[PDB]
Design a protein around this ligand. Sequence first.
Ligand SMILES: Nc1nc2ccc(Br)cc2s1
Length: 118
Amino acid sequence: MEKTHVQLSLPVLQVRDVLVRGFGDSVEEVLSEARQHLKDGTCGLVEVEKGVLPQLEQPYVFIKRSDARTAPHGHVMVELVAELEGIQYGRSGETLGVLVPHVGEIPVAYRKVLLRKN
Ligand SMILES: Nc1nc2ccc(Br)cc2s1
């Protein structure tokens, strides 16, 4: 009964503030945990610049843009793609950032997304 997409506003975190730097130890675990934290409202977003990924823990979970005309209600359509050792699991568009657990860090902005469930 899960709708295919859900509107979310994600807190954007600075990399040096992040206390839990990843979701787990395998591609399937990080995708699973990211989905659970999105459902629980406990997922943040770090924007990727030089130096960011080496300060976070692999496997990475990215949100990537899934289309070009759908910004329904101001929310960009996105889907999840994981990365381990330079191999990516999914193919999608431009990266909006890397997802991490949110445990109370103060954000610098909020990013509105329309997230594809599965
Ligand atoms: N299978 C499921 N994946 C997700 C991702 C995000 C949100 Br919010 C709920 C669910 S339930």
